[PDB]
Structures are given as structure tokens and as C-alpha cells.
Amino acid sequence: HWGYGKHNGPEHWHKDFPIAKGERQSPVDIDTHTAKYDPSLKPLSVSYDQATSLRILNNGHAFNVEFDDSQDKAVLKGGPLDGTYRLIQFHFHWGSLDGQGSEHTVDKKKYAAELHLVHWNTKYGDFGKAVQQPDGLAVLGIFLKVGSAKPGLQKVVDVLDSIKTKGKSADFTNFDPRGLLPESLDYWTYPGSLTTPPLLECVTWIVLKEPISVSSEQVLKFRKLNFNGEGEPEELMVDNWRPAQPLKNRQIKASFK
Numbered sequence: 001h002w003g004y005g006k007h008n009g010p011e012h013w014h015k016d017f018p019i020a021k022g023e024r025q026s027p028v029d030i031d032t033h034t035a036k037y038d039p040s041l042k043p044l045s046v047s048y049d050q051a052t053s054l055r056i057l058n059n060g061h062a063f064n065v066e067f068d069d070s071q072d073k074a075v076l077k078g079g080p081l082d083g084t085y086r087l088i089q090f091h092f093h094w095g096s097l098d099g100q101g102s103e104h105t106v107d108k109k110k111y112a113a114e115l116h117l118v119h120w121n122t123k124y125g126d127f128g129k130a131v132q133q134p135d136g137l138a139v140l141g142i143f144l145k146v147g148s149a150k151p152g153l154q155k156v157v158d159v160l161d162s163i164k165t166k167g168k169s170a171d172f173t174n175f176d177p178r179g180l181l182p183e184s185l186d187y188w189t190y191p192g193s194l195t196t197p198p199l200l201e202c203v204t205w206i207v208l209k210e211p212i213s214v215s216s217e218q219v220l221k222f223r224k225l226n227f228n229g230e231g232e233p234e235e236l237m238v239d240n241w242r243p244a245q246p247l248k249n250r251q252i253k254a255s256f257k
Ligand SMILES: NS(=O)(=O)c1c(F)c(F)c(S(=O)(=O)CCO)c(N[C@H]2CCc3ccccc32)c1F
Pocket: 059, 064, 088, 089, 116, 118, 127, 131, 139, 193, 194, 195, 196, 197, 198, 199
């Protein structure tokens, strides 16, 4: 039932998914002054050179760029992590207006969008098993601001008209997710959850400090997507973000400053 509206948006999710009110929900506001610098946090190791993009899909909430996760080809490690985590997909959350769209906030600042690169811990063998574990996933979150175009994003932007509506897919090979990363890998980290139902508390969040820049034209193409399926009334895919949730008993750690 769930989605992003008055009637079925984030404030309703708890009725189907009670953990929505749990102890380690995401996203959160990142209070930069109160984040704890941890000298012992390692640099993040992002090894995406063998990544094998396969397909891009409109799942009716967002669009997902999928990877072959049947071998260690695109992996995240280091940082605050203790194992190796394989990239399964990325997606974005974005707004109706440039002034909103991110899930995490930084000193209450909203960004225009937020990229989630989703990885699962190889010690659990597959994504479905990993989501049942408290250290099953590592999600790398990257903020988007509007300004100069991100040229590594354009291949995603240009395919979107082929996946306008829920359930559409398109071959999407040879997409290189290194083109979506900012210069710095400095990050904040905390234990949290998936930000969409089922809201499972299985995620080590790693949120990069440095946003990427995308153009107004790029984010405008995200907003032409539709949450409905073909042959239904148009509902633009905008404002597909969950607001910040209570931090409760958590400390956000910083790799820097
Ligand atoms: N926004 S988020 O970063 O916290 C995030 C989620 F919120 C979320 F719910 C899921 S899910 O359980 O797999 C959805 C399956 O039904 C994923 N995981 C991925 C991998 C599989 C998949 C399929 C569809 C949509 C997202 C995901 C997720 F990355």
C-alpha cells in the first residue's frame, strides 16, 4: 500500500511496518557539531573498477541501477565496516523543488536529492539474508546539490524516458558508478535502517560530507518519471524521501575534522 502521499506516505508506514517507530530508524539529521570525530575510523575503500551494471528499473518508488552481485566485482570495505560488502544497486530520492529531496539532512539542511549505493555483507551470502541481520547492509549516501552538471550522471538521465512508468526496465550495461562520486571520501557513519518499507534495521550508513553537483536539467528529468504504471493517471515521481527520524540512542561518528 505504502508510497509517498497524504494517505500512504511516511507518516502512515508504521501501521504496516511497526519498526517504523523503532530504535535505529533512518534517515536522521546529522548535527555536524555533535558528530564525534573518530581517529580510529579507516578510509573508505570503494572498489568499483569491475562493476557490472545490468539494468535500470522503475520500481514505482524510485529507479534502481542494478549490478551483478554474484561475485566480488564492486565492493565497499574499510571505513567503519568489518567485512566486504557487494554493490547490488543504486537509486536516488529527490524532491519536487531544489530545496528538498534528501533523506539525511546536515544541520537541518536539505539537499535536492540523495544517492544511495546499496551493498550487502558477503558473510550472509545474499541480499535477502543480509537484510535480516544488524550488520547486513552498508549504504553509501551521497548528497546532490543543483549547480553544474555531473557528466557521469547523464547516461542515467538519458535512459529515463525509457522507464517512465512503474515496472519498466532497460538494459543498462557498462555504467560506471565511479562517475557519481565526489572528490572526497570523508564521511559520517551511524547504525540505522532501510528508509523505505520494510524499514529493516540492518544498515551501516556511510554518508559522504561532500555533495556532488548536478544540473537543474538533470534533476528536472528525474521529476518527469512517474510513480504510476502505464495507462494510469499521471503522478509525477517527486518527493520520494522519508523525513529525518529520531536519533534515539545513537552517536554519529565522523571520519574527519
Ligand atoms: N533507501 S534504502 O537505501 O535505505 C533501501 C531500502 F529502503 C529498501 F527498503 C531496500 S529493500 O528492502 O531491498 C526493497 C525490497 O522490496 C533496499 N535495498 C535494495 C536492494 C534490493 C532492492 C530492490 C528495490 C529497491 C531497493 C532495493 C534499500 F537499499
